[PDB]
Amino acid sequence: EARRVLVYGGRGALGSRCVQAFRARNWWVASIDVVENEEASASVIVKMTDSFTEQADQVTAEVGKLLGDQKVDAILCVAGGWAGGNAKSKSLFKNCDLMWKQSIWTSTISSHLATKHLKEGGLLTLAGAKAALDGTPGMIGYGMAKGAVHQLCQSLAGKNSGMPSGAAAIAVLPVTLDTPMNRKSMPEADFSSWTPLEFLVETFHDWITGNKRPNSGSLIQVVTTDGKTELTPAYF
């Protein structure tokens, strides 16, 4: 059930594949990002600023004029990334602002675009990370941004949150996805414990089209061991 999709983080490794395969199946796919994704039906360009309200208003404004009264089947917020740093760090403040702008800013503008552009029965997927289900001493910024996003699921799953009737919020919780960049930077890493980008496209495919879709509020873990990926509930 799905010929309309919004991918926040459209040019980034996983979002890019979601743009590629939903077009291979003739869905209209649109990419919200800091750059244009030429393979998308359309791209919306996010404005670099320090003002959350200023980037928030320009993005919500231009998805306004692009969709008009067209609702979407799914918004997949897959924007995100990584920066390390413990609390004693040099870089703690540079990385915290990078992380907050990458997951807490993007998941909050997407949530709003959900309450306005999203179908009843539709789907908002949020980008969590399983590291954050506990203390992340070595990456304050990361854990904080993604633990914020897991609390946000619980809230959109809540009575009177703004989510369209029958639509759902599901935070996907990876350990390490498997991108060319990750392979380049973490060379001697067991790539067989990284999830393939395709298993998440496959998963958003079943979920978007009613197939075995998990309750709103759901924090779904994605663990790959030796090539085999597993989806497991986490409870907040």
Ligand X SMILES: NC(=O)c1ccc[n+]([C@@H]2O[C@H](COP(=O)([O-])OP(=O)(O)OC[C@H]3O[C@@H](n4cnc5c(N)ncnc54)[C@H](O)[C@@H]3O)[C@@H](O)[C@H]2O)c1
Residue 73 engages ligand X in binding (rule: CB under 6 A) = no
Is 235 marked active-site?
Answer: no
* Residues 27 and 2 sit within 8 Å (Cβ to Cβ): yes
229 binds, among ligand X, a copy of itself, none (CB under 5 to 8 A by kind): a copy of itself
Cα 95 from Cα 90, distance rounded (Å): 10
The beta-carbon contacts of 53-61 under 8 Å, at least 24 apart in sequence, are: 55/105, 55/109, 56/105, 56/108, 56/109, 56/112, 59/32, 59/109, 59/113, 60/109, 60/112, 60/113, 60/116
End-to-end CA distance of the chain: 30
114 binds, among a copy of itself, ligand X, none (CB under 5 to 8 A by kind): a copy of itself
4 binds, among a copy of itself, ligand X, none (CB under 5 to 8 A by kind): none
Buried b / exposed e over 122-152, threshold 16 CB at 10 Å, is bbbbbbbbbbbbeebeebbbbbbbbbbbbeb
User: At its nearest, how many Å lie between ligand X and the CB of residue 48?
Assistant: 7
Which positions from 168 through 197 interact with ligand X, judged by CB under 6 A? 174, 176-177, 179, 182
The residue among 65 and 90 lying less far from a copy of itself, judged by its C-beta, is 90
Say whether 207 counts as a known binding-site residue.
no
Q: Which of 118, 141, 142, 170 is catalytic?
A: 142
Say whether 26 counts as a known binding-site residue.
yes
Site residues for ligand X per CB under 6 A: 8-9, 11-15, 32-34, 46, 78-82, 101-103, 105-106, 127, 129, 174, 176-177, 179, 182
User: Residue positions in the annotated binding site for NADP(+)?
Assistant: 6-30
What positions carry a catalytic annotation? 142
